[PDB]
């Protein structure tokens, strides 16, 4: 069982940045998040199948958007139970996940994702945001 969602990360605010189209995969077997960058014709980029491995992303500590690199690489071998991860609650249309410093915003669900949300979280409102499918 995998929750599939279309999402976009806009790097255009920086120098020489594009609107990357990404597909999110929320693995419920251990609650991990995987990312696949959608391929567009004549993209001019090195084809890398996986944008992000199957790993649990910790929620940002603050709202400033700055990523905390101490969790990943730091000589202080610390493992605290307060590290809240990106669970299935956050998967919402229009939700902006702060993922490693990237503000990736979710547009559309899948049919199974809609069934999941309507079956446990009670979210019966479906309203996909246009701008998730790269032009063919």
């Amino acid at each position: 069982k995998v929750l599939r969602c279309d999402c976009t990360w806009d790097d255009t605010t920086n120098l020489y940045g594009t609107k990357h189209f990404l597909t999110l995969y929320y693995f419920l077997s251990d609650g991990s998040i995987a990312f696949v960058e959608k391929d567009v014709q004549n993209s001019g980029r090195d084809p890398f199948p996986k944008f992000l491995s199957r790993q649990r992303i910790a929620k940002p500590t603050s709202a400033s958007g700055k990523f905390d690199s101490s969790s990943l690489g730091s000589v202080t071998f610390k493992e605290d139970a307060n590290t809240v991860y990106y669970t299935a609650e956050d998967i919402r249309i229009g939700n902006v996940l702060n993922l490693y410093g990237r503000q990736v915003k979710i547009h559309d669900y899948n049919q199974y994702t809609r069934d999941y949300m309507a079956e446990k979280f009670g979210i019966t409102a479906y309203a996909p945001i246009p701008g998730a499918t790269p032009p063919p």
Binding site: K1, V2, A34, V36, P49, R54, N110, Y112
Partner: protein, 439 residues
Amino acid sequence: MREAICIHIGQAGCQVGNACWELFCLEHGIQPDGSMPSDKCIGVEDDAFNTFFSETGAGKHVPRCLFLDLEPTVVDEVRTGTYRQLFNPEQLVSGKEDAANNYARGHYTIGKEIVDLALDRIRKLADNCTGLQGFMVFHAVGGGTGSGLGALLLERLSVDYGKKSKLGYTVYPSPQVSTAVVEPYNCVLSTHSLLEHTDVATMLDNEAIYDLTRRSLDIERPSYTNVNRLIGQVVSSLTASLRFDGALNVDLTEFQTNLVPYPRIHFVLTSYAPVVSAEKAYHEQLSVADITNSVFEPAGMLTKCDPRHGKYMSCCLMYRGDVVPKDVNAAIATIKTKRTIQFVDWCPTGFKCGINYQPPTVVPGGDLAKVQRAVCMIANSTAIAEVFARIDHKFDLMYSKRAFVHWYVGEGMEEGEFSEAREDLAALEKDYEEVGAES
């Protein structure tokens, strides 16, 4: 990238391929119509199916398989089965007359009039592959088709494609529990192709699978379906290293160079665990150490090859699931401490561990239970001398009185080929003894 061409020779090969491909489609989320569903996703849509499935322009997956058989009923069963829309109209070569347990008939009379089309289909498969590791050929040397036509195809592939990877999953007939009468003749004749033109040969004798399923799966009546399901599970476990990411991903040649010490020493064992039913699956603490012990203990393998009667040379353990890279080496250390199994003196390492993050998948109604972690061993050991040393005893007992030889000589084979095969098997046994001898 990392394509692998599957070939299925004979009725046994065709049924094994049916099980393997249904398992592969279920594991990659491919419906029998050949199209993945948009609404339903089982995992990442990464092109991990490229090794086994080719994607057309309509988002439809076609297997990279060639079902070659000299007789038409199994091919027509596939053509009228559930995966009829899955399988290509070509790549499904059906002859007009069976080889009828005759190596000579399947290698000289009917084999040569179909090997051309087989090579054409193989080339059609190959030109669509850019990173082809090699050919996995599933066959049973007991049957005439799978023996003779398989041998001819192996020689043609060796002379055409060169040094490409060649893995033959061969179902040797155990003389104690066997079906055909001339299948010892067929096996002895096919040793030539399985020794020179088969780069790695995997033992898949039938009644080892049979009794393993009988005692471990609580299935008092195992059948060809269960045997093929276990074979498909083993093949999927071997291929998962390249198919999916893992802690220690291994390609074909990567573990092949670790499993083959000498060019002629490549007839290897196989085993799989935890091969357990649903009832006992939830009652057993299926730890990595436990599954490794069950794999290495002599009874739990898929071949009548007791390690107590020989010496291990190289064991390659493929772990699937959430196996910690420390559970594996702890299990290997406790295996070293356990002296019920011995290793050859010139291979202190002896172990090749590869871990993959994809747990095995279960087919609906299959023998296997839903298990989180699993491990499959491919072991080259000197104890594999005894299967040859009794199949050649079978061969000599029949050959002393020249029984059934008239069929082979009529089908275009010289009588000297039998003597050459016997001498080749004797040389293979002699070099097994030499490699197992203490330095």
